[PDB]
Amino acid sequence: EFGHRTLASTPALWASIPCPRSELRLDLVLPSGQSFRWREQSPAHWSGVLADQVWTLTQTEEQLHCTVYRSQASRPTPDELEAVRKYFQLDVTLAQLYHHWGSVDSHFQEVAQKFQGVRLLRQDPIECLFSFICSSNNNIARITGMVERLCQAFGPRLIQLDDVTYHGFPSLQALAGPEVEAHLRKLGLGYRARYVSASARAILEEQGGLAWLQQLRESSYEEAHKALCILPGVGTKVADCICLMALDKPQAVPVDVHMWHIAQRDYSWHPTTSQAKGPCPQTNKELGNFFRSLWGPYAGWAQAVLFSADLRQ
DNA sequence: GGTAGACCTGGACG
DNA sequence: CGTCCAGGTCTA
């Protein structure tokens, strides 16, 4: 048996974590632009790297089926499945949050019907940092390719399924190496080729390496957000992403075009205390606060719910 | 402190 | 085929 597995082709190799489509919708999470490393190689079967390992994920109505490629084949262990639960944060009950945002908001309660199972992935800081550095002034379609080539170039080779080889996300040492930028431009990363190199070296030579970054999962949102921006290619929008998706700051509200349109069309929002009228540093910060008060401690997850709906719209 | 102007690039539209 | 735009950040 070769190629990517399916629930039908290789039943004996799939374990299932109990999970209803209301709690998680793969087709509304993985390609939604949180991670750029999941592909639907097979219909309803999403494959990608998780915890330095390849997985294929598919879901029924009450179960989420998982299969792992580690050299002996076997269904996922109890601990390997745990890695999956951690990734989708399956302890955070979406049904509750949905009730709360719908309870204190009407427009949400409306869109919160057609779009369920939209949660946040608990991503690794490094992968998330550099992935979202490539997102600025760019489209999800492009970003995916850039991150794919980036990983192929400087990422550890994992395994090969079909004509697809998977790579662990590059390390700081890898991204800081000589002539990385020159290499990354060949991969068409554009002006962001420098941002990656600079940030890799900045973190590893001026900040304290990996330790500095990871220790922001304990810091406060305000602390971490402030900490990130000093990195090249990292502004408020990019920082809010890293915080929200990797740094465990659920109140982080990434403000961008989509969020600014939604904040002008669906909430008729208007910059109260701001000299300007458009997306200037000031307003964007204020806009975020507005959602943090509206939706609360998890204004970030709520954003992701609407943001996803707006994409497939 | 508050502002446009630009950028690498690849896909849409007029 | 030129103008715009996409999960914006860095600049005189």
Give me the resolution in angstroms, 1 decimal: 3.1
Residues annotated within a binding site of A: 137, 142, 192, 254, 256, 258, 275, 303, 307
Residue type, A164: V
Residue A222 burial (CB count, 10 A)? 11
Task: DSSP letter for A248, please.
Answer: -
Residue-range domain boundaries for chain A:
1-88, 92-112+253-313, 124-249
What's the rounded Cα separation, in Å, for the pair A245 and A264?
A: 25
What's the rounded Cα separation, in Å, for the pair A151 and A178?
A: 16
Could you please state the CATH topology (level 3) that the domain comprising A92-112+253-313 is classified under.
Answer: Endonuclease Iii, domain 2 (1.10.1670)
Specify the CATH number of the domain A124-249.
1.10.340.30
According to DSSP, the residues that pair with A66 across neighbouring strands are A15, A57
If you write DSSP's letter for every residue of A252-263 in order, what string do you get?
A: ----SHHHHHHH
Quickly count helices (H) and strands (E) in chain A.
14, 7
Q: Is A40 helix (H, G, I), strand (E, B) or coil?
A: strand
Q: Using an 8 Å Cβ cutoff, are A15 and A76 in contact? A: yes
Question: With left for phi above 0 and alpha for psi between -120 and 50, is residue A43 left, alpha or beta?
Answer: beta
Residues annotated within a binding site of A for DNA: 137, 142, 192, 258, 275
Q: How far is CA A175 from CA A53, A154, A192, in A?
A: 21, 7, 13
- Which nucleotide has its C1' atom closest to residue A142's CA? B10
> What's the start-to-end Cα distance of chain A, in Å?
39
Specify the CATH number of the domain A1-88.
3.30.310.40
Q: Helices (DSSP H) in chain A: which residue ranges?
A: 78-88, 94-103, 106-114, 125-133, 140-154, 172-176, 180-186, 192-202, 209-214, 221-228, 236-245, 257-265, 281-294, 299-311
Mark the nucleotides of strand B covered by protein, meaning any atom under 7 Å from a CB. 2-3, 7-11
Experimental technique, in short, is X-ray
Nearest of A176, A182, A88 to residue A130 by alpha carbon:
A176
Q: Is A266 helix (H, G, I), strand (E, B) or coil?
A: coil
- Which nucleotide has its C1' atom closest to residue A241's CA? C7
List residues, Cβ < 7 Å, touching strand C. A 33-34, 135-142, 229, 231-239, 241, 254-259, 303-304, 307, 311
Residue type, A80: E
Cα three-residue angle A2-A3-A9, rounded to 5 degrees: 75
Nearest of A245, A219, A178, A289 to residue A37 by alpha carbon:
A245
Residue in the block written with tokens 């550890």: A156
What's the rounded Cα separation, in Å, for the pair A292 and A290?
A: 6
Q: Is A196 helix (H, G, I), strand (E, B) or coil?
A: helix
CA-based R_g, chain A, Å:
20
What's the rounded Cα separation, in Å, for the pair A31 and A312?
A: 10
The residues of A annotated with a catalytic role in the active site are 237
The residue length of chain A stands at 313
Residue A166 burial (CB count, 10 A)? 21
